[PDB]
Structure 1
Amino acid sequence: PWEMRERLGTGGFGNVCLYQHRELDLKIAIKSCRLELSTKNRERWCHEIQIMKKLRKLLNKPENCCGLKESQILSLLSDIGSGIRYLHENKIIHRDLKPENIVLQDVGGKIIHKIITLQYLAPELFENKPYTATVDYWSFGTMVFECIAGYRPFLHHLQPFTWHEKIKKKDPKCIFACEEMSGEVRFSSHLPQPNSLCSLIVEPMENWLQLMLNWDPQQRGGPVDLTLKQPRCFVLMDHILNLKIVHILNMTSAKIISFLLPPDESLHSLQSRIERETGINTGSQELLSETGISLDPRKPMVYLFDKSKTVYEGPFASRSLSDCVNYIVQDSKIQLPIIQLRKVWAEAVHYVSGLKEDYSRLFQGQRAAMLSLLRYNANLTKMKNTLISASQQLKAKLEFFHKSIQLDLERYSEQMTYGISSEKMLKAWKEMEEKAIHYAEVGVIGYLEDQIMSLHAEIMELQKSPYGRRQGDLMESLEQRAIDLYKQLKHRPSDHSYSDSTEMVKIIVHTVQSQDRVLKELFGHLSKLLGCKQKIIDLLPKVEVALSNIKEADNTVMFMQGKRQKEIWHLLKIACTQ
């Protein structure tokens, strides 16, 4: 009771149709018979049934055309790296490595990738040579480089009949070829600069690219350690895919610096590392969670605060542009070919989206700092209730105590009138009364209570603060317009070779204007937040020591009254003696 849901793809046996039973969601891809395949390859097709039973869409998204995220490429190395390790354990050579053969499985966010066109065709496959797994290595590092470039690793849009002949002329220690608009073929052993990656892993991934893209198949992934059945490629993948790196945005300078983490460094020696890095003293270096929880020093993207610095100035976030982009800043109206234009405009929307994530992370650190302020406020309310409570407890004990000793001095004075009492305990108890009247801490709790309601009024005022995310969605609109202009460029055929880019530069203008606005308002927010936070931190030991003094006069006075009791018991037993 179901139908064909959607034609999934094609194949040598025929087209693939993904099915679904709407009453039961019976999802299955079934490669149908469309090609009328020869019976030899039909038997080999059922062999493929016994063995199989034994992404490019996301790439063509205009956001993704710049290159992918860090953890996306890392998780791609995990899924596809582990997958081809499993396949090379199973003696399998797919010969068909492409993002069109990558199924995306969203398990709650965990995008599990599985395995199921001449630029992925190896040059040994391009001329039908003896093959091995290094072919699939070549396509692997090919595709993973395309995950950050947005394009092929070698002479993009060159026809493979001579493009593979240029592949035969590659410097093997170099990894990337770029061609100028004059046709200048040059090489690079470096990554092209608009990435989204941190250099600390890029350089072992650079040498990894030096291994994975040598066109000699005996050298491509060649140093295979038979200790671990892996090349040095998979050694570096094992290192990097477990290489712990803490990324820290300096909130005070708007700078993210990554850090290699040795597997047993304490957080304090890390504070020494950031201390040497930034100059910020560890007593003033303050760090806390993404959710706004201060980091436990007892433990081994968190956000950097300087306690000893109060007012934070404007951003020290240098946000560069390329000389092509700067050339558009000089004149956006030059009529240049689209080979430049898709690249440069991708760098532009790339740049703007980078600014959006900058404000996004700064927005996060602001919210998290406000959460820490709320926790400090909560402890302030707890010590408030403790203070008011135990303070009025002290006041009542004062009242009851002195009225008690007033009655005791009346009757004791009547016994001194009877020639019974002694004047020494009389004067002593009058000193007890005088020291009780000295215990006049009931004004201090009202004054520091006025400090409490002062700061509580301040943080209630900080609740009603306006937010720059109002202009953050304006940045979303500007970036969205930039995406739309990139799409309108992207669907142009070769007849639309020359174009203008002025409105995008206007989006850059209003972008940096709005970003300066939300940074000024934002730094005003954080400035008042850390100010009132400092007021709370300075307020706490006063409340603590004062409450301690309350407990001092508490146990003091109770001991004094019990002393008065026992003295009356002494005069009792003395009168029992006589």
Structure 2
Amino acid sequence: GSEQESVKEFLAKAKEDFLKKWESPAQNTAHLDQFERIKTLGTGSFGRVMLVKHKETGNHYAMKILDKQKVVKLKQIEHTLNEKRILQAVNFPFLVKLEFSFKDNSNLYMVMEYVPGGEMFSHLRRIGRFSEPHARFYAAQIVLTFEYLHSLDLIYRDLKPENLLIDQQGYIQVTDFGFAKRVKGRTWTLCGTPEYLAPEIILSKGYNKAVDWWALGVLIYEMAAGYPPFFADQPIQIYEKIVSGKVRFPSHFSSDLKDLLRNLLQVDLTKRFGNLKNGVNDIKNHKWFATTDWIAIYQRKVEAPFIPKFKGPGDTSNFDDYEEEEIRVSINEKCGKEFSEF
């Protein structure tokens, strides 16, 4: 009706803000030695994330640290450069704010909002499975975020409960844009967790922003069941199940839920919700989302069905423990050419 025009005006003004920041990025807006180290919140192959404290304000932040040589080694140069470029340009309720980003001899740094509530994946594995009103609350934030990112021609490509974190109001904060990419039309890079890959990725003949909507289906299922739809011991066996498309829903799933998941986990991307003439509004006006007030979710007015524990600031009880490894600032500037524009 009349409310369709208001959201398009918002998305237009939203794109204008994005283009102006995409055009004129912020660069080397801080340095390591104004951040006190506290704890490792996560680790990886070519990097880690850490809880750090800014000395002048006292504020706590999550500092993603990437090893330059390791980023080159695994051919993650463009990916890394995109992540920082996309983070500093975007702005939405459920996307983490990149506050500072900078560079030294051996490493890249991305200082972001600390979200103390931990990953959705950890909460899911503790509780076992979310109820449907609980999963719908989380899924509505993803539908809005994807609408916002897709309108800016940004595919996310790394949706999973691990990347969705809980803030103290019980809402979702999307972090990790390491496989995110601005792309009109097709793109090819084989990337993402095997559980969440759309079948058109695996077939390796290009793909579009509709892979995000498949990943939404995989999320909603995993949130509701407590395990993912395509599961096996190895990832190769996960791929043969995805391309076949066969999915076994549990007894306790609603028929409204099932109808959505069959429509989101569509092998034929011609018939997949999110990639039709209405696009996202087939997902918004589905029966399963009839109870969701879309404006109220954006404004963060809806009361959260889970609000996590909070002992104090700089507390990491909602995170696993890893071995505290050293940060090595080298004397010789490594890979300066490759990460010039970071």
User: How far 1:150 moved relative to its partner?
Assistant: 0.9
1:42, CA displacement in angstroms? Answer: 4.0
**Residue identity matched to 2:242:** I
Q: Larger Cα Rg: Structure 1 or Structure 2?
A: 1
Structure 1 residues 21-62: Cα deviation after superposition (integer angstroms, max 9, x where no partner): 58954222222132512398546534432221111111121x
Measured in 2, the distance between the counterparts of 1:35 and 1:2 equals 20
CA distance in 2, matches of 1:147, 1:41: 30
Q: Which residue of 2 aligns with 1:79?
A: 141
User: 1:114 matched to which residue of 2?
Assistant: 174
Q: For 2:274 and 2:56, locate their aligned partners in 1 and report how far apart those are by CA, in whole Å.
A: 52
Quickly say closer, same or farther: Cα 1:129–1:59, change in 2 above 3 A.
farther
For residues 135 and 274 of structure 2, what CA distance do their matches in structure 1 show? 23
Q: 1:542-561 maps to which residues of 2 (within 5 A)?
A: none
Q: 1:203 aligns with which of 234, 255, 261?
A: 255
TM normalised by structure 1 equals 0.33
2:79 equivalent to 1:4: no
CA distance in 1, matches of 2:53, 2:274: 45
Tell me if the contact between 1:213 and 1:220 (Cα under 8 Å) persists in the aligned partners: yes
Structure 1 position 97 matched with structure 2 position 132: no
Cα distance 1:56–1:106, how it changes in 2: closer, same or farther (>3 A)?
Answer: same
List runs of 5+ in structure 1 lacking aligned partners: 178-190, 196-201, 244-578
Q: Which amino acid aligns with 1:38?
A: V
1:382-420 deviation line (CA, Å, top 9, x unaligned):
xxxxxxxxxxxxxxxxxxxxxxxxxxxxxxxxxxxxxxx
- Whether the aligned pair in 2 keeps the contact of 1:99 and 1:143 (CA below 8 Å) is yes
* One-letter identity of the residue aligned with 1:241: T
Bigger relative contact order, structure 1 or 2, given CA contacts below 8 A and separation 6+?
A: 2
Partner AA of 2:284 in structure 1: F
- The one of 130, 151, 160 equivalent to 2:227 is 151
Q: Is the 8 A contact 1:56 1:99 kept in 2?
A: yes
Which residue of structure 2 lines up, in the alignment, with residue 212 of structure 1?
264
Displacement of 1:2 in angstroms is 4.9
Cα offsets for 1:59-117 (capped at 9, x unmatched)? 121xx21x21343212102211211111111111111111111121122xx43343433
Please, which of 51, 64, 82 is the counterpart of residue 86 of structure 2?
Answer: 51
CA 1:11–1:119 in structure 2 vs 1: closer, same or farther (change >3 Å)?
same
Gaps of 5+ in 2: 1-33, 90-119, 177-192, 295-342
Q: Is the 8 A contact 2:132 2:224 kept in 1?
A: no
Does residue 14 of the first structure (1) align with residue 47 of the second (2)?
A: yes
Aligned with residue 234 of structure 1, among 284, 289, 302:
284
1:544-568 Cα shifts (integer Å, max 9, x gaps): xxxxxxxxxxxxxxxxxxxxxxxxx
Residues 133 and 90 (structure 1 numbering): CA distance in 2 closer, same or farther, change over 3 Å?
same
2:5 aligned partner: none
SS at match of 1:30: strand
Q: Deviations over 1:171-223 (max 9, x none)?
A: 5xxxx32xxxxxxxxxxxxx41245xxxxxx3332211111011222322266
TM-score, structure 2 normalization: 0.54
Which residue is 2:335 aligned to? none
Q: 1:95 to 1:10 in 2, by over 3 A?
A: farther
1:34 aligns with 2:99: no
Q: Which amino acid aligns with 2:174?
A: K
* Cα-Cα RMSD: 3.0
